[PDB]
Amino acid sequence: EGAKRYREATKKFFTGIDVTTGQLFDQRTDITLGQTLPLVFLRSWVPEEQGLLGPGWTDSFSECALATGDRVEIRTTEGASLYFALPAAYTHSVNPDHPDFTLSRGEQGYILRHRDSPVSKYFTLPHPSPRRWLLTEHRDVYDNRLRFIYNKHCQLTQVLHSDGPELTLLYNLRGQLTEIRRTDERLQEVMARYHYHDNGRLAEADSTQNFHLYYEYNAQGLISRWSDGDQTWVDYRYDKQGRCTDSVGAGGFYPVHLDYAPGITRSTTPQGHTTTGHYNDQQLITEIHTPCGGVTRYEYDRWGNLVRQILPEGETLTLTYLADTGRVTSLTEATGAVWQYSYEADSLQLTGMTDPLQRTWLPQYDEQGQPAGFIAPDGRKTTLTRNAFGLVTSETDPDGNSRTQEYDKHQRLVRVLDEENRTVSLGYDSQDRLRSLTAAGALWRWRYDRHHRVAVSDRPDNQLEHFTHDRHGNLTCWTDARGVKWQVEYGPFDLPVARRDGEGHRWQYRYDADTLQLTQVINPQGETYSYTLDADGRVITEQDYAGTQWHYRYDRSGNCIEKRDGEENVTRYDYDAARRLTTLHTPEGPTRYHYDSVGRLLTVDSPDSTLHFEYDGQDRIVREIQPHGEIQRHYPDNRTAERQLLTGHPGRWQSRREVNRVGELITLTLAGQAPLTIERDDAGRDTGRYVDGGFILRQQYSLMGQLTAQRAGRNPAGVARRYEYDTALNLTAASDDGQQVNYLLNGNGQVISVGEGRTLREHYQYDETGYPSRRFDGVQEIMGETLYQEGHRLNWVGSHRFVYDRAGRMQEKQFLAEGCRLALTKYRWNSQNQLTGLITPDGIPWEYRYDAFGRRTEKRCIQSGKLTTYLWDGNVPAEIREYQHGRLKMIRHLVFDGWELVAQQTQAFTLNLDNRVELMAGEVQTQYAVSAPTGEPLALFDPAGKRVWRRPKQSLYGLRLGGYGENPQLDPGLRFAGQLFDEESGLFYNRFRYYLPEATCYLSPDPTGLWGGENTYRYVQNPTKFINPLGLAGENVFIHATNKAGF
16 A cells, blocks of 8 residues: 554664664754643654655644545654544544544544643644645643644744744745744744755754754765764665665764665674564564574564563563553563553543552543542542643642642743742743742852853852853863862763863773773773673673673573672572562572562572561551561551561660651650650751750751751750851861861862861872872871772781782781781671671681671671671661670660661660679660761760760771760760771771771772772762762762762
């Protein structure tokens, strides 16, 4: 037939070119406006079609309908038309091959609507001369409109949007469209420009909001070369039948060769690796063969609905349909879980979904049939409200909490009022660019360049930050409020090839030609980090800056089934058909995972521990079983939670938390004690905690949200502190009781020196890579020239020499004094997680055990009888117990609010009779904490308000350099956020890695890789403004202090 099936553009497979036809796919958006319904000028390439922009180019404004007396054809902006049979005996028609569209008869012409959209298109203007009907408007069910106005001689001159926006089209004497201008409330802004070759084919397309592109054509009127005009281009060569055989981009990117045969298309790279398609007579892809092997197969209904998918290992996903509706009723996963759907009879709109656990959700619909909330499985309704224009003005939860929105006369959102009656106010330029935002008495403003990109930001503090974009919209330079410049450079495809710090040091990147994945990083000291890719683009080996290597192997479907490190340790993985990890094999044994029908973990079994979980209804966890204890969460209410810990000398601990309708803790209650009240500001920051007639804490914040003061005590000595900040928001000074400390920083915000009363206490220097290593003094003098081996691995630190393992772990530490004999500290790493495993100091050994999540469970020393056990409530401890000679010394129950300690209870046991009795069981004592921003506890207070413990004096990077005060036994054991102190070794325990304070570094390389950061052994850039709470990736403690160009 003289037709081609319509495809939805998500069912098409591309290389470089549509594999099924050898046809170039180009589709570019040039304008985008409007608030209620969108006004979008989009153009696409279809060589044998015409419209605005001349031969070959067609666009959203030139859609039309044709009617051959009883059949109607709609010419959409895709490569094919829609066909409908509409006799004079019928009001509406549907075609099973594109069942989303319905065509209905109109007053004059036809009306086309897509099921899941509110917008309908009216082809109701006769073109004077099958019969051609022009597009005349779009209309919402809300009677919003977008009107197309034609002059005499049937040119489109204007497009009017009922909100306000309004476009004028302009033509030259040859009728060629040359410009589109926005002509709206005395505006004259030019929105796009077009230029043509002498033959009238489109030569250029300059778009204010988008890109400037150029086009060249071969002698057969087919595209030969498009370019950015600066560094990007792709080149195309064609066969005698119009099909594309070769493509090459700039820089050697995307090199493809295509071979065509009837039913089969194979595409090959310059290396000879070949992908193979198969497709059926409807141009639906049936098999894909990848170059490493592996065959994926698809099977279709007679109307081209996908019914079955088989992955190359045999995972089979099946579907079933409601005969001709095109509506899916069952989806069966490869694990056998069945999902079920049902639809309304009169109109094919979803009335219910059932999941494999027999929970049912019911969608709800307003008048005009637009969604209006849902009924949850519990029977609890959520509702929505809409103004006369269809904009959501109210949303409501079954608790009665509600969120409210208000709209300008141009239907722009101008005020958002949230569930806690905090308000945000917005402001707009005449061109609808977001000009202003008022959030909490802080006012933000922005200015824009001629391409509608942010030029200047004007912060609440009256500071100016400047942005410079290239013509393509890549942020080439950022200038912060100190005038330091951060710069980054872009290559052939807006891939960044280099970036330069404010100190001026430069980094470089290299990309894979076939896939544009990152394959190399060059250090400012010339060291290199590298990936090697498979034929399928999988990473099969990576190599570290120091030259450590890892190797991987994969299965047919793409899962990773083996890892080999450089110590010859082979880790293996087995997966279920849903790609969940199901077994882990290690030199130390198997670990087994078990799941339910829905993907919820029920049991992890491991060489030395077992975890169990139970869930209740809303996928809250209600029980956990761990080694050493249990947790039982009650949840009596939507805004309450009660936790009980049972451990065992049987012990129990209870707490209750209450929440302020927006998720923030506002009260804490410990069983035997009067409650603690937490106050919240309009930004949700904690401004104070108090116990009635007792402890009170008060805190102040700047308009940039940084903490500027703390005061605490028996309000009616405590702590009394102040902070000062730079204009780039680095901390410059801190003071307590007048003892001011001063920090000075280089052009990276790294502390050069610490002065405390004009005396210099500490100073530091940094190398070209940012490692906090070169001459430094905190407690001893560290020299810079013997600090590192080959790749930021430690060589000499004072009188200690370090030896490293073949796998890049630290293996020994040697105190080579030359006056004393050998002192050796030994570490015994395992393989599952580079867990420390064991340690031998100058004498007595110590051993550690871990859970199945990487969370330490024990710490034992058999020689002296010391054991420490831990119970965990998530990413932070819940209970700690400490034993010697088989009896308790201490127990700590701890409550956290984020990474910041809020309260602590402690019982202290001691035998006094020297008889087999656990004597003098003491009384629980509650302490309330005051903490620094980066998570270090500063002081602890009695509920009555008396201070009972105070932090010793401390170095920038954590070294203790004062003495212990009163009550050293009440020290919680916490350092920066996420870390615990090990006094036997002087190491700070992060979850996945161990930190050495004396060297500012971790003992082992990053568990993830370059995702964690470019610096594999560095802890953090600045201990006073960053935290690293898991061992994986550092983050800013305050928002608005983040680097906007990236790092």
